[PDB]
Design a protein around this ligand. Structure first.
Ligand SMILES: [Cu+2]
Ligand SMILES: [Cu+2]
Ligand SMILES: [Cu+2]
Ligand SMILES: [Cu+2]
Lengths: 475, 474
């Protein structure tokens, strides 16, 4: 140890890192314009990258996901997207760039044991730019991006960065009044999106395709209803969030925020197979109707609540969709039947008197490796302290809530199940940190500095199995 | 005291509890950001990204913080930037054509929640300067130096207007970049007066530049080999900083290339002494007054470039590192506050591992009782950079610790207990905050810092604190 003259020992922070293991945390920084990998075994930032260095004129570094690497310390690859345009104006920061870049870039970056290397922009390769959740396929042979301004999600080939398939979603509201457009129901169309360009390419880079000028914020479903969200076709919006993956392969689920549904897709045969109904009180599913070989519809009598967070248990047994704002809860499906998602039926709802209000919103989660516990974020607007709720995933009950500080975002877990590692991001202008909480008795062990506005974080997985509790099955 | 797991798990909050209630602030160089960090909780308190404010080459560079009675409620600070071809000088494969010109001097106020960009004092005064930033010992102003333009100036805190500016020019004996300094020359020290309405300078951005980028450590060899582009490289002296004597009255401008520091009378606006850097030269060179606005000093040969420069917190010693051809710490007796002409060379700190070149000792900080100094040791990749502990009574190296790549600045908590510095991955690799306890001079470890920091401070509370902050040394 290190002793004073008094024989009292100094605290070495290295002692704190010793216990965490050999794990590499990565996180983008939103308005900071940077992305950073951290060695949780030493406290060092291993390498960071500033997209402005590459001529990016709106480097709002947004979602990300890391491919497994046998040894992350020697190398790993990862995907990180950006947003642009009026997403720049939506936080508490008096930005002065009135005409910023359009974003929707999808960067491929490789850490090489020393530095980050920006490989290319896959949105340029494919011509498809998408700016919300990034996930890796369970096979680690590609990745997926959702976007809630264009309402397009797509799975991409890891090697080529070419779109394997893309789905576009559209809203036909029963009542063409923004106030009632979702409440009073409507019909959502699912359309196969095909390349319109030479070389198998799309012509949907940057803001091409945008229905609204920014991604809705938490509870922003109120704001688009209230006419506060500008764009060409807000009545047509469904706010696609993510395409998450069944860890057993075959199925991918696209979350649609405004109509409160998730669409299960056959990855191989590239068709939709089921629509899951979010709000408590609705059946397990809504009816999928084929119109033609490229087009399907689903009618929703009414939208009781918006939904947001979506994903699978590591064993593929359960599927989860969070209702948010008008109901705050966790809706749970039995997805044990890997053969037929039309059989998936609701089996539980995690609820709490504490979720009475319009907040908190439960918009990120991570499961323990053994699928018995979930850690779920609790977000509020300033100044309410944000935190984590620990969920019993066997009985479907809230074990515990802890307060942390402002603007809680994502949660990752060391692959041995021992430590949850999360990010708080200051609403882009105030306090921000990495938080560490041990999963045995669920005690917060403290904070590490992180001067970034993280809307995502991952721990680099070693294996296909690690990926089941990484940015692949949940967001 | 304990939860359910008893003492099973290490809480990082213990680590911070011993550090006390101090706020670390640092700029991020290529990160384009600047950040304040609470050493008592491990939170970043606030961060600011200059690209948000239309900055197109946001190389956030040096900074200094004004004292505040409670830095957790509010504090003010000054951070400048670099631009043009300073963008192209590190390992990053940048793809920016027509980068911003930089040399902005941002005023930023932390208001207990957020950072607020107040203005660019370079736009206010018309004078942009891209190297060291310091606070006056009275905290009523600040100063900035520049080694591309060879200008330094002290500014009023309220108005952001120049109180005085100095321009420095080299007349080399031999008109050959190879010999322009080895073979000596005359350096001119000239009052710099404004040209524009309202007493404004016409020197923003890259206006005034002799060379296209600030000299890297050991980079005086690059300018000699004429691998530094620019209009007037033979005229370069590479001013580094303007530091302050904590007792007041005097400020000292460090000149890298001709190996000297110039002492200036602040209030009367005259240079009063030239301190000669290399071991082997006299205590001073002779100051010659040509008219009320112009002085010259002759330097037969330049034995070595110098860099770090500063005062002990009581003002008793003044130091200038030799840092190219010699590698040592040159020390002067500056106890005579009345007259800088009397200041005499009193010691040279030497070490067997200091040959050249590297390590480059370009930052330092003292303990509050002036008994010890902490000195960076910089090397290019892949040599381990680290810290040197200096005995400031006997003038010898106590200890050297290895840390990691690319060591930059060092600050100290104001009770004397913890040195906090930054390492910066040459802007593309590993970076961190380092904490070292001063009692036995041992490294407590590192904290994450995804930034390229070329500066960092602990926000001072009082004028006394400022003596060991970014005021007396760099
Ligand atoms: Cu989301
Ligand atoms: Cu976001
Ligand atoms: Cu310097
Ligand atoms: Cu620098």
């Amino acid at each position: 140890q290190i002793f004073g003259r008094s024989g009292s020992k100094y605290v070495k922070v290295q002692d704190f890192y010793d216990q965490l293991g050999k794990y590499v945390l990565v996180a983008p920084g939103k308005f900071s314009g940077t992305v950073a990998a951290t060695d949780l075994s030493t406290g060092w930032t291993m390498a960071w990258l500033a997209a402005w260095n590459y001529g990016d004129t709106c480097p709002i570094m947004h979602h990300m996901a890391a491919f497994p690497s046998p040894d992350p310390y020697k190398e790993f690859e990862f995907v990180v997207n950006t947003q642009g345009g009026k997403n720049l104006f939506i936080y508490g920061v008096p930005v002065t760039v009135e005409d910023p870049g359009e974003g929707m870039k999808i960067y491929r970056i490789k850490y090489d044991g020393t530095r980050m290397n920006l490989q290319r922009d896959a949105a340029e390769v494919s011509g498809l730019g998408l700016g919300v959740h990034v996930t890796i396929t369970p096979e680690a042979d590609g990745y997926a991006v959702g976007d809630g301004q264009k309402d397009i999600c797509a799975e991409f080939d890891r090697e080529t960065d070419m779109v394997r398939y893309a789905w576009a979603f559209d809203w036909d509201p029963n009542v063409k009044d923004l106030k009632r457009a979702w409440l009073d129901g409507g019909t959502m169309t699912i359309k196969r999106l095909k390349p319109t360009l030479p070389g198998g390419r799309y012509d949907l880079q940057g803001s091409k395709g945008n229905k609204i000028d920014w991604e809705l914020v938490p509870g922003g479903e109120l704001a688009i209803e209230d006419g506060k969200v500008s764009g060409d076709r807000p009545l047509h919006s469904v706010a696609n969030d993510a395409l998450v993956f069944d860890p057993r392969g075959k199925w991918a689920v696209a979350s649609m925020r405004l109509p409160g549904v998730c669409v299960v897709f056959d990855r191989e045969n590239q068709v939709p197979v089921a629509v899951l109904a979010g709000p408590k009180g609705t059946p397990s599913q809504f009816q999928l109707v084929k119109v033609d070989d490229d087009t399907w519809t689903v009618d929703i009598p009414e939208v009781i609540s918006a939904g947001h967070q979506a994903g699978f248990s590591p064993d593929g047994q359960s599927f989860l969709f969070m209702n948010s704002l008008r109901q705050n809860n966790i809706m749970v499906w039995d997805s044990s039947n890997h053969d037929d998602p039309t059989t998936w039926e609701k089996k539980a709802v995690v609820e709490s008197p504490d979720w009475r209000g319009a907040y908190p919103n439960t918009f990120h989660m991570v499961f323990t490796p053994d699928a018995k516990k979930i850690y779920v974020t609790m977000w509020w607007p300033s100044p309410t302290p944000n935190g984590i709720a620990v969920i019993d995933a066997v009985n479907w009950e809230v074990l515990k809530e802890v307060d942390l500080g402002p603007d809680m975002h994502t949660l990752a877990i060391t692959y041995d199940g021992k430590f949850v590692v999360g990010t708080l991001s200051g609403y882009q202008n105030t306090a921000s940190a990495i938080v560490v909480m041990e999963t045995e008795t669920d005690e917060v062990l403290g904070f590490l500095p992180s001067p970034m506005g993280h809307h995502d974080n991952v721990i680099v997985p070693r294996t296909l199995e690690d990926l089941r509790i990484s940015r692949s099955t949940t967001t």
